[PDB]
Amino acid sequence: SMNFYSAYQHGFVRVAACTHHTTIGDPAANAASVLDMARACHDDGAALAVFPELTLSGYSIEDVLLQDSLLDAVEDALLDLVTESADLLPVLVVGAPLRHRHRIYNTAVVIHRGAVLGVVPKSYLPTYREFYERRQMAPGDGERGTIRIGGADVAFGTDLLFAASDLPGFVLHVEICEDMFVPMPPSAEAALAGATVLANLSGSPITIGRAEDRRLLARSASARCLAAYVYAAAGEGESTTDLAWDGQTMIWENGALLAESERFPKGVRRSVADVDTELLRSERLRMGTFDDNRRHHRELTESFRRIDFALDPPAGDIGLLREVERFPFVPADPQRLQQDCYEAYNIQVSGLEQRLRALDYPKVVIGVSGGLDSTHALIVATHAMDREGRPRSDILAFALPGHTKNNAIKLARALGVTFSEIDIGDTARLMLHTIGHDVTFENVQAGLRTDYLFRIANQRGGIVLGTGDLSELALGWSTYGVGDQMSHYNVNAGVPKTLIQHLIRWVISAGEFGEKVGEVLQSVLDTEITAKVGPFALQDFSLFQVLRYGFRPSKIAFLAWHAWNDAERGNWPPGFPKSERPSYSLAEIRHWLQIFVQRFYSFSQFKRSALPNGPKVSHGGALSPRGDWRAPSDMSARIWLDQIDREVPKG
Amino acid sequence: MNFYSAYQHGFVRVAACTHHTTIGDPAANAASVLDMARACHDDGAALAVFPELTLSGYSIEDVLLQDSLLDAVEDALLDLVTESADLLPVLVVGAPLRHRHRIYNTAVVIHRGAVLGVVPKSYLPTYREFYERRQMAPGDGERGTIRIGGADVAFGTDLLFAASDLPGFVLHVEICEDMFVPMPPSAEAALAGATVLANLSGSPITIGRAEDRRLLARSASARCLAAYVYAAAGEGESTTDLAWDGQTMIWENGALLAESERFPKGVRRSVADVDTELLRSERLRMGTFDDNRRHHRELTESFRRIDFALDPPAGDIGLLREVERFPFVPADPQRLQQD
Amino acid sequence: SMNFYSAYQHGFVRVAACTHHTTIGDPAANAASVLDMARACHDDGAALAVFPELTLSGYSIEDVLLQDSLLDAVEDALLDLVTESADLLPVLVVGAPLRHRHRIYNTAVVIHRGAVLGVVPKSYLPTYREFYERRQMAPGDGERGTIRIGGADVAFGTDLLFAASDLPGFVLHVEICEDMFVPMPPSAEAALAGATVLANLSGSPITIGRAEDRRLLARSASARCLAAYVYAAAGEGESTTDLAWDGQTMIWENGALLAESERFPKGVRRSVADVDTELLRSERLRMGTFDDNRRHHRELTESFRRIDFALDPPAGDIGLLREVERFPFVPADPQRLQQDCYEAYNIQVSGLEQRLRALDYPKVVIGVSGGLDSTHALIVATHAMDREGRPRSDILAFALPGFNNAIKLARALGVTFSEIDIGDTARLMLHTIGHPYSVGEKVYDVTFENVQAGLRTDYLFRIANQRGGIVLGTGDLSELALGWSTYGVGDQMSHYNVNAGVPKTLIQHLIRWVISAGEFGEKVGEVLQSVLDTEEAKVGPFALQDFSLFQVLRYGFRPSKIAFLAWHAWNDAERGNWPPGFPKSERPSYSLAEIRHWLQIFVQRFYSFSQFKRSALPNGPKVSHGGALSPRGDWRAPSDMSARIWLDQIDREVPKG
Ligand SMILES: Nc1ncnc2c1ncn2[C@@H]1O[C@H](COP(=O)(O)OP(=O)(O)OC[C@H]2O[C@@H]([n+]3cccc(C(=O)O)c3)[C@H](O)[C@@H]2O)[C@@H](O)[C@H]1O
Ligand SMILES: Nc1ncnc2c1ncn2[C@@H]1O[C@H](COP(=O)(O)OP(=O)(O)OC[C@H]2O[C@@H]([n+]3cccc(C(=O)O)c3)[C@H](O)[C@@H]2O)[C@@H](O)[C@H]1O
Ligand SMILES: *CC(=O)CC[C@H](N)C(=O)O
Ligand SMILES: *CC(=O)CC[C@H](N)C(=O)O
Ligand SMILES: *CC(=O)CC[C@H](N)C(=O)O
C-alpha cells in the first residue's frame, strides 16, 4: 500500500535553511543565487527553503534601501523568482524591502509554484548599537490587509499562516531576526494558533558570542513552542563597512539540533533536514497546558489568516535526512551518556533513600543471581545506605538456588553486605508434588524465591528490593504476583535494559567503590553481555516510540530500519566492540515489532497494573499505572497487528 | 392526510442505543453501531444516540493518545458516514478526534451520507475515577469548523440541527458531564430553540449513579420543555477499575417515555415517539421560558443552525407511546391514590 | 479547645423554611405571624428563616396589590419587622410588593439584626394559566443599583450575595418561585458565583402533581449546584377564589432531603435543619468541572455583589438537627438497601465477566475459608460463569487448612472443590528460614501468620498457572483501607479482586440479598444462611472504621468532624435507625472515648501505614458512590507519609471522653 521508504508518507517534511552569496545593491545577482540554491532544494525534495534577511537587496546597505532604482530592481527580481517558482517544489521564503502605503517594510515573501502566498513584515526594528533599521524601514506589527505584488493582492501582515492542505502537520509561520529576541515573539503566538514550522530570516552581523545568542533563542523557541525552528543568517557579499557576517544556518526541532552549517563559509551553504511532523503532533497532543495557553490568548490566536497551498511532495524513496539513534535510551555521545548515567543512578538512589528514611531504616532484602539487574540493584542499595549513614551489613543479599552465581557471592563479599544462601529446591519439590506435578517447575521456583524473600523481610525487619527493569515491564517478562514482578520498592523499574549495562560501567569508571568491587562488576559485564522474544535493542527502541509519542507501527519500523539496517552507518555508544555491532533487516524489525505490539498493548498491562513503588528515570517515560502509562488490562492489540500487515513490507 | 401516521401527527421517533464496545477496536464498534442503526431505520426512527466515545471505547485511557487508535477511529467514522447514505435516522456517534493541538471528546452527527457537525464535550471530569483532562481537551468556547474526510463541517458547542421538513424536531447534543454542571450547555440550547436534547454517556456504574442520571435527565427535560435522550456505555468497556450498566432512557418534559434493561446481556435500545406538539404547546404557554431566553439573548442568539431534511416515513408505523385512557385518572395505583 | 458539641463549630448552619398564617390585605397581621415564627427560629439558634412569596401582602390579592393603602401598609409593616430583628439572631427573608422606579416589584427583603441587607426582585413573572403576575408586577431580571427603605439605600437586584463573615461556608442567594423553573435559573449562576445556600420564596397555589414538580426542581437544583436549597410556600389564609394552598416547606442539601413539613397544615409550620457547609465545600473542592463552568461564565459570575454580615451564632451545644446514619455504606431504609445490593452485586459480576471474556474464559481459582468475603466472592463468580454460559466446574475452589461451610457451599453450587493442606509446606518454610516454631517454640508472630497467608496465595497462583486459571481476590474495601491483609505474596494479591470495592459492613447484606433473591436455591440459601449465622478486634469495629472511611474517602473531613458525626450516629443505640438484619441484641452503642480511640487507629493506619499495599493493587470494579481505594482511580496518595497532623488534631480538638 504505502511506499514504506518515503519520508513524506511517514509524516516527515524536508526543510532547508540557506545562506546565499550577497551582491549588495544588486537584486538580479541575489536572485540568480537564490534561484540556483532553490533548484538544489527542489532536487533534494525539500518542502521549504528559507533565505537570509533582505535577501534581494542585501541587509547591510542602509540608505541605499531608499533609492528608487534599488526598490524597482528589487521588485523586478522578485517577479522573476515568482515566475521561476512555477517549476519548483519548495515554498521559498525570500527577504525583500517592499513599498507599502507610506514606507518600505523589511519583508519575507512566501512564494510557491508561480504565485506569492503572502508577505510578512519584520515586526521589531532594532535602533540601537550597530542597528539603524527604523531610519529606512517601518515596523510591521499590527499591519494587516493586503499588498499588491505584480497585479495581485496577496495577504500582508504578521498574522499569517501557510498551511499545506495535503500535509496537515506542516503549518508555516515566518518571522524576521529580532522578532525572536523580544519577550513576546510573533512566532510564539503563531505556534499557539497552529504553526508547526517557524522560519526566521536573519541578517545578524556576527560578534563574539552572538552565535551563542542565536542558538539560545532558536533552540528554546523550538522547545517552548513544540516546533521546528528554521534559521538563516546573511554571509559573504554583505558590506564590511562596520560589520562582519558569518553565514550561519540551523534547523531546530523541539530543542534538538537537526542540522547546522559551517560558519564563515567560502561559498553558499545549506542546512537540510527532515522534520518529523508527527513528533510535534505527539508532543502537542500530550502537553495540554500548551493548549491551555492558547485558550488563555484566544482572541490573539484565533485571528490568524490561514493561507492554504498544495505541496504535492515526492512520493518515492528520497532517503531520510535525519539522525536516528539506535538507542533512544542510550545517547551515542559520550559526554551526553555520562550525564544520563549520573542522573539515572542518583535518581534510583535518592528514590530508595526516601523510602528507607520513611520506614525508619529497614534491612534491605535482595535476591542476587549474578545478573546485570540484581548486581546493579545491589550497588544502588549500597550507595543509598552509605549516604544515609547506614551499615552495609543491613543489606541482606540472598542467593536462592533450585557460572553466573559466583559473581553474586564475590560482589556481596567485596562490598561487605550480609550474604546468605537459601536452597529453595526442597520447598519447590514439596510444592510440585502437592500440586500434582518445564515452564511449571520454573514458575514454582521463581514464585518461591519471592515468597522466601518476603518472609525473610517479615522476619528480619526488612523490605524486599525489586530488580526487574523497564524493558521487562514493557514486555510482561516476569512472574506476576508471587514472582519477581513483586517487591516492596523497585529501583530498576524505570531503567531500560539497554541502559543497565552502561550504568554499571559508569559506576566502575567512577570507581568510588573499591578497585576490588570494580573487578567483580567488570566480570559481571563480561560474563553477562554475550529472555527470548526479541533483542532488547529493538524492543527498547519500539518502547520509546510508543511510550513517548504513541507512534504507529509502520512509523516505528521505518525509524528502526533507518537506525539499524546498516551496521556501519550512524553512531554507536561507547562499550561496543566492533564484533558486537549487529544489523537487522526489515523482516527482523517487522517480526520483533509484531511481538512488541501484541505483548505491550494486550498481554502485559495486568502485570504493570499492580506495580510496586520506584522512581521514574528516563525523559522517554516509565510504566507506572500511577504515572506515565494508564491503559486497560483487558484489551486486544488487533488494531496494531493489522496496521503492520497492511503497511509494512514482509522483507 | 394519513391519519395513522405518527409523523404526520407531529411525533418524532427517537432511539437511545447501547452497543457492544470492543475497546481499542473502532472497526468492530462501527460494526455494532451500523447493525443497530439499521434496526432503527427499520423502526422508522429519526435519531439514534450512542454512548460516549462509541468508536474507541470510553475506558481506554492513554490508548486514546495512540496514533493507530486515532487513524482507525477516523477510518471507521468515514465508513459509518458512507453507510448512512441509505439510513433514515440521524446518527449521533462518539469519537476521539484531532482538531488543532489536541484530541476532543466528540459526538459526530451523521445524516444520509454527510456529517452535519461535530460536538466537543464541554466539561471533562478529572476527579475520583475520571481522568479525562489528561488525554482530552475541553470543548467549551470552541467554534469554527473541522476537517472530516474532505469536508469542513461545523465544530463546536453552539450547534442546533433542525429538520427543514419537521420544525418541531430541533436537535442539540451534549456529552455526559455536560448535563451535571450548574449551567448545562443544553439549558442554553433549549432557549435557543433545541426541543430534543441528546446526551452520550460513558458513566461507569456505581451504587446510586442511576438515580443521579435519572434526576438530572428528568429535571433537564422538565426544566427545558424538551425530550432528553440518554445512552450509557455497557458491556465491553474495560473493567480494570470500573463497571458499566448500559442504561438508556428517553424523557419528555419530566415524563419517562422508554428505558432499557440495566446490565443487559447484549445490545439494547430505548425507542419512543416524542410529541413535538406537546413540547411546542408548553413552550407557547410558558412565557417565562422566552423571558429567560431574552435575558440571555446574546448567549442564545449566537447558536448556529444546521439544516437537514429527514424525509420520514409517510405510513402507519404504529405509535411507540403509552397514551393513558384517563388523563385525569392515573392507572398506576400509587399515583392515583396520591392524586 | 473548640466546644466539641457545638454544631456551629463543626461547619453546620441551622436553616429554617417557614410557612406562616396569611391574612390577605393585612400586612400588620402577616408581620405579626412572621415575627412570632422568627422568634421561634431565634430560639432554635437558626441562622436563616425563609418565608413564603409576598409574605407581607398575601400572594393572591391580585389588583389589591396596586392599592396605595396596601402598598403603604406593607412598607410600614416591614420597617417594624426590621426594628424587631435588632434582637433576632437569624437572617430573615420575607416577601413584599415594593415600589421602585415606575412599578411594584415582587421582592424578597433579606433582613438581619436591625438593617435590610438587600431587596431581591422576582426575575421571572408567570402570566399564564392561573398566574397573572405581569399585570401587577414588574420583572426583576437585570435590575441593579439600590432601593430606599426606611431612610437607607440598600442593594437592590438579582445579583446579590449575602456572605456571612464569621461563617465563610454560608453565602446566601435568594430567588422567588418561578425563578427556579426556567432553563437558566438565577440561582444556578449564583452557585457558580459562590452561593452555598439557595433560598426560594413561593406562593405556588397547590394542584395535583405540583408538589412533585416543586421537589423535582428544588432537589435537582441542590444536586447540580452542590448547594442547600431552602423552600417555603404559602398555605392557610391565601385567597380561595380560584385556588388552594398547601403551605409546603422543605430543605434540600446536595440532592438529599434534610427536612419537610406537613402538607395542608392546621396552623403554621417550619422545616428546621442543620446544613453541613463542609459537605458542600468538599464536594465543590473535588468536582473541578463546577469551577470550569464558572470560568466559562466568568462575566456572569464575577458581576455579583457580595454583602457581608456578622452572623455571630451561638457557641454552645444546640444538638444536631440532622439524621446521621450509623452505616454510610449501608442505608437504613430497606428498599434503598435492596437497591444498593442489586447494584453492588451486578457491578461485581459484570466486572469479573469482562475479565473472563477478555481472557477467553480462563478457569477460576478461589481460596474458600467459609468466611463472609470468600463465601460472597464464590457466589459472584458462580453468577458470572452462568451468565457467560461457562460450566460451574471451571470454578476451582480450594480449602487451604493451616495450623464445613466452604465445602458445603462448594458442593451445593456444583463447583470443583479441593483441599490442599499447606501445613507441611509451612513447616518446611519456617525451618528453612530458621523460625523458632520449627524447633518447638510457640512464637505466633507476623512471620508465622504470613508464611501461611503467603503460601495459600503462592499455591493458588501456581494452580492458576498449571491449570489455565486466574486467582480471584477476596479482600474487601475495609481491609484495603486499614492494610488488614498480607502484602505482595498473600491475601492482598490476585489476578482480579471482586470484593475490592465492597466494604465489610456491606458484605453481609449482600449475602442476605443473595438468599432473598433465591436464585441459587434451597440448599445454597441454607448454606449461605448458615455462613451468616456462624459469622481483628485490634483494628476496632468495622462499623466504626467504615464510618470513618466514608468521611475521609468522600469528603476529606478533619478528624474532630468525624468524631462529631460518629458520636451523633453511634452514641445511643435506641436513637435513629438501623438497617434490616440487626437483632435487638446485635445493636451496640459507642462512647466518645471508644470513637476517639479507633479514629486514632484509623488515621494512623489509613494515611500512613497502609497506602503501600493499596499502591500495588490488582484490578477490580469500584462499587460505592462513597468511593473505592484503587490507586489508578479514587485514591492517589504517598506510600511514605506520616499521619502526625491528624493525630495532633485529635489531641487538640476531640475530648478524651
Ligand atoms: N489480563 C489478565 N488479567 C489477569 N490475569 C491474567 C491476565 N492475563 C493472564 N493472566 C494470568 O496471569 C498469569 C500469567 O502471568 P505469569 O504468572 O507472570 O506467567 P507468564 O507471563 O505466562 O510467564 C512468565 C514467563 O516469563 C519468564 N520470566 C519469568 C520470571 C522472571 C523472568 C526474568 O525476568 O528473569 C522471566 C519465564 O519464562 C516465565 O515463565 C496466569 O495466572 C494467567 O492466568
Ligand atoms: N511503606 C512501605 N513500603 C514498602 N514496604 C513496606 C512499607 N511499609 C511496610 N513495608 C514492608 O511490608 C511488610 C509488612 O506488610 P505485610 O507483609 O502485609 O505484614 P503486616 O501488615 O505487618 O502484617 C499483616 C497482618 O494483617 C493481618 N491479617 C492479614 C491477612 C489476613 C487477615 C485475616 O484476618 O484474614 C489478617 C494479620 O494480623 C497479619 O499478621 C514488611 O516486610 C515491611 O517491611
Ligand atoms: C536578528 C537581529 O535583528 C540582530 C540581533 C538582535 N539585534 C539582538 O538583540 O541580538
Ligand atoms: C455521564 C452520566 O450521565 C452519569 C455519570 C456521571 N459521569 C456522573 O455521575 O458523574
Ligand atoms: C410560583 C410559580 O412560579 C409556580 C408555577 C410553576 N411554573 C409551576 O409550578 O409549574
CA C425 from centre of chain = 49
Helix H, strand E, coil C: the string for C111-179 is EECCEEEEEEECCCCCEECCEEHHHHCECCCCCCCEEECCCCEEEECCCEEEEECCCCCCEEEEEEHHH
Please confirm, yes or no, whether B121 is among the known catalytic residues. yes
Cβ C179 under 6 angstroms from ligand 5: no
Task: Calculate Rg over the CA atoms of chain C.
Answer: 30
Which residues 374-433 of chain A have a CB within 8 Å of chain C? 422-424, 426-427, 430-431
- Residues contacting A517, CB < 8 A, separation 6+: A411, A414, A415
C36 and C159 both lie in a single domain: yes
Residue C69, phi then psi, degrees to nearest 5: -80, -35
∠ Cα C254 C257 C263 (to 5°): 140
Which of C433, C465, C495 minimises the CB distance to A455?
Answer: C433
**Which is nearest to A17 in space by CA: A43, A48, A55?**
A48
Among C320, C48, C96, smallest CA distance to C196 is for C48
**C136 burial type by CB count under 10 A (0-12 exposed, 13-18 middle, 19+ buried):** middle
Strand order in the sheet with A418-421: A418-421, A395-399, A363-367, A462-466, A489-490
Whether B209 and C346 have beta carbons less than 8 Å apart is answered as no
Indicate if A99 and A246 belong to the same structural domain: yes
CA–CA dist C222, C388 (Å, integer) = 41
Torsion of CA A452, A458, A459, A460, to 10 degrees: 100
Residue C238 CA to its chain's centroid (Å): 37
Q: Are residues A304 and A343 in the same domain?
A: no
Atom number of ligand 2 nearest to Cα A461: 44
CB contacts, 8 Å: A638 with chain B? 24-25
* Residue recorded with cell 447514505: B85
How does DSSP classify residue A599?
I
CA separation for the pair C326, A566 (Å, rounded): 72
Q: Count of CB atoms within 10 A of residue C233's CB?
A: 29
* DSSP run (H or E) holding A326: none
Ligand 2 contact via C505 beta carbon (within 6 Å) = no
Does residue A68 share a domain with residue A207? yes
Q: Report whether C201 contacts C174 (CB < 8 A).
A: yes
Chosen domain end from A323, A339, A367:
A323
In whole angstroms, give the CA distance from residue C583 to residue B179: 43
* Chain B interface test: which of A161, A285, A287, A295 (most B C-beta within 10 Å): A285
The residue from B17, B74, B121, B174 that is catalytic is B121
Do C647 and C605 share a structural domain?
Answer: yes
The distance of Cα A299 from the centroid of its chain, to the nearest Å, equals 32
Q: Which residues, 6 or more positions from C197, have their beta carbon under 8 angstroms from its beta carbon? A: C13, C15, C48, C170, C171, C172, C173, C227, C228, C230, C275
Core vs surface per residue A611-636: b (16+ CB within 10 A) or e: bbbbbbbbebbbbbbbebbbbbbbbb
From the list C367, C399, C360, the residue with the least C-alpha distance to C381 is: C367
B209 is annotated as contributing to ligand binding:
yes
The CATH number given to whatever domain includes residue A582 is: 1.10.10.1140
CA pair distance A557, A580, nearest whole angstrom: 22
- In which element (H, E) is residue C61 found? none
Angle at C266 between CA C265 and CA C268, to 5 degrees: 75
Which segments of chain B are extended strands (E)? 11-18, 47-49, 90-99, 102-111, 114-120, 126-127, 130-131, 145-148, 151-155, 159-163, 170-175, 196-200, 227-231, 248-252, 255-259, 268-275, 304-308
From B283, B251, B285, select the one nearest B270 (Cα to Cα).
B251
* Inter-chain Cβ pairs, chain A and chain C, closer than 8 A: 132
* Pair A339, A299 in one domain: no
Report CB contact under 8 Å: C425, A430.
yes
Among the partner-chain residues C435, C619, C640, the one whose CB lies closest to the CB of A609 is: C619
d(CA B63, CA B71): 12
Cβ of residue A283 closer than 8 Å to a chain C Cβ: no
| Alpha-carbon separation of residue A647 from A7, A9, A109, C320 (angstroms) | 14, 11, 39, 69
If we measure between CA atoms, which residue out of A375, A357, A358, A355 comes closest to residue A366? A375
- In angstroms, the CA A636 to CA A613 distance is 27
Pairing of the two strands B11-18 and B268-275:
antiparallel
Pairing assessment for the beta strands B90-99 and A146-148 based on DSSP bridges: unpaired
Would you call C624 exposed, middle or buried from its count of C-beta atoms within 10 A (0-12, 13-18, 19+)?
Answer: buried
Written as nine digits, the cell of C169 is: 461556608
Report which residue type is found at A615.
P
- Among all ligands shown, which has an atom nearest to the Cα of B121? 4
Closest CA to A206 of A176, A249, A174: A249
- C163 touches C13 (CB < 8 A): no
Q: Which of C458, C617, C641 sits opposite A451 (nearest CB)?
A: C458
Sheet of A249-253: strand order equals: A256-260, A249-253, A228-232, A197-201, A171-176, A160-164, A305-309
Pairwise CA distance, residues A468 & A374, whole Å: 8
Please say whether the beta carbons of C292 and C298 come within 8 A. Answer: no
Hey, is the C-beta of C292 within 8 angstroms of any chain A C-beta?
A: no
Closest C-alpha to A366, from A477, A426, A454, A476 = A454
**Do C265 and C152 fall into the same domain?**
yes
Domain count across chain A? 3
Q: Which residue of C has its CA nearest to B140?
A: C296
Tell me: do A521 and A604 sit in the same domain. Answer: no
The response to whether residue C213 sits with its C-beta less than 6 Å from ligand 5 reads yes
Point out which residues pair with A160 in neighbouring strands. Answer: A305
Return the amino acid letter for A94. Answer: V
- CB-CB contact of B195 with B164 (8 Å): no
Is B231 within 8 Å of B268 (Cβ atoms)?
A: no
How far apart, in whole angstroms, are the C-alpha atoms of residue A30 and residue A33? 5
Long-range contacts of C269-273 (CB under 8 A, 24+ apart): C269/C18, C269/C19, C269/C235, C270/C16, C270/C17, C270/C18, C270/C19, C270/C37, C270/C40, C270/C41, C271/C16, C271/C17, C272/C14, C272/C15, C272/C16, C272/C41, C272/C44, C272/C46, C272/C321, C273/C14, C273/C15, C273/C16, C273/C321, C273/C322
Nearest-ligand number for the alpha carbon of B212: 4
Q: What's chain A's Rg over C-alpha atoms? A: 30
Give the HSE-up count for residue C639: Cα atoms under 13 Å, Cβ half-sphere.
22
Asked if A318 and A328 sit in the same domain, the reply is: no
Q: Name the burial class of residue B327, with classes exposed (0-12), middle (13-18) and buried (19+) by CB atoms within 10 angstroms of its CB.
A: exposed
Cell triple for A154: 496577496
How far does B133 lie from chain A, in Å, by closest CA?
Answer: 8
C150: its cell numbers: 426606611
Instruction: Extract the C-alpha cell encoding A462.
Output: 526488612
Amino acid at A354: Q
H or E element at residue C59: none
Chain B touched by A285 (CB under 8 Å): yes
Q: Does C513 touch chain B (CB under 8 A)?
A: no
Residues of C in contact with A292 (CB under 8 A): none
Q: Please name the residue of chain B whose CA is at the shortest distance from the CA of residue A169.
A: B100
Q: Give the residue, out of B58, B133, B186, B201, with the most ligand 4 atoms within 8 A of its beta carbon, to mutate for a pocket test.
A: B201
Task: Mark which of C520, C535, C550 sits at the end of a domain.
Answer: C535
Q: In this complex, do C343 and B208 lie within 8 Å of one another by their Cβ atoms?
A: yes
Q: Hey, are the CB atoms on C429 and A452 less than 8 Å from each other?
A: yes
A53 among known catalytic residues: yes
CA-based nearest distance B210→chain C, Å: 10
- Annotate C85-98 with b (16+ C-beta within 10 A) or e (fewer): beebbbbbbbbbbb
d(CA B319, CA B296): 37
Radius of gyration of chain B (CA): 19
Closest B-chain CA to A278: B67
Closest CA to B18 of B242, B321, B263: B263
Strand partners, A13: A275
Q: Alpha carbon B335 to chain centroid distance?
A: 30
Coil vs helix vs strand at C22: coil
Give the number of other Cβ atoms within 10 Å of residue C559's Cβ.
Answer: 26
Structural domain span for residue C547:
536-657
d(CA A551, CA A545): 6
Three cell numbers written together for C269: 409550620
- Measured CA to CA, the distance from residue C28 to residue C44 in angstroms comes to 25
Ligand 5 centroid to residue C218 C-alpha, Å: 12
Asked if C523 reaches chain B (Cβ–Cβ under 8 Å), the answer is: no
* Joined grid coordinates for residue C10: 463543626
Handedness of CA C339, C342, C345, C350 (dihedral sign): negative
Q: What angle do CA C200, C204, C205 make, to 5 degrees?
A: 165
C141: chain B residues, CB-CB within 8 Å: 291, 295
- Which amino acid is residue B191, in one-letter code? L
**CA of C464, closest atom in ligand 1:** 42
> Cell 567560502 sits at which residue?
A266
Stretch (H or E) spanning C439:
none
Distance CA(A318)–CA(A562), nearest Å, equals 13
Q: Return the CATH number at C141.
A: 3.60.110.10
- Number of CB atoms found within 10 A of residue B41's CB: 18
Tell me if C424 and A434 make a contact (CB, 8 A cut-off). yes
d(CA C90, CA C43): 10
**Same-domain status, A442 and A541:** no
Chain-centroid distance, C-alpha B42: 19
Name residue, grid cell 444546521. B306
Say if residue A306 is in the same domain as residue A190.
yes
For C8, phi and psi rounded to 5 degrees? Answer: -70, -40
Residues A640 and A618 in one domain: yes
SS3 category, B134: helix
Going by alpha carbons, the residue nearest to atom 34 of ligand 2 is: C536
Q: Which of C430, C457, C465, C636 to mutate to test the interface with A (most CBs of A within 10 A)?
A: C465
User: What is the C-alpha separation between C461 and C442, in angstroms, rounded?
Assistant: 29
Buried b / exposed e across A322-360, counting CB within 10 Å, b at 16+? bebbbbbbbbbeeeebbebbeebbebbbebbbbbbebbe
CB C194 within 8 A of CB B304: no
Q: How far apart are CA C415 and CA A118, in angstroms?
A: 77
Q: How far apart are the first and last CA of chain C?
A: 14
| Interface contact B292-C184, CB threshold 8 A | yes
Residues whose CB falls within 8 Å of the CB of residue C309, separated by 6 or more in sequence, listed in order? C91, C112, C113, C117, C162, C163, C164, C165
> At a CB cut-off of 8 Å and minimum separation 6, what does C175 contact?
C120, C122, C123, C158, C185, C186, C187, C190, C198, C199, C200, C201
- The three-point CA angle C229-C232-C234 to 5° equals 160
User: Cell 549487529 appears where?
Assistant: A582
Half-sphere exposure of B294 (CA within 13 A, CB side): 10
DSSP for C363-413 reads EEEEE--SSHHHHHHHHHHHHHHHHTT--GGGEEEEE-----HHHHHHHHH
- The residue type at C611: Q
Domain boundary among A271, A297, A323: A323
- Identify whether C622 is a catalytic site residue: no
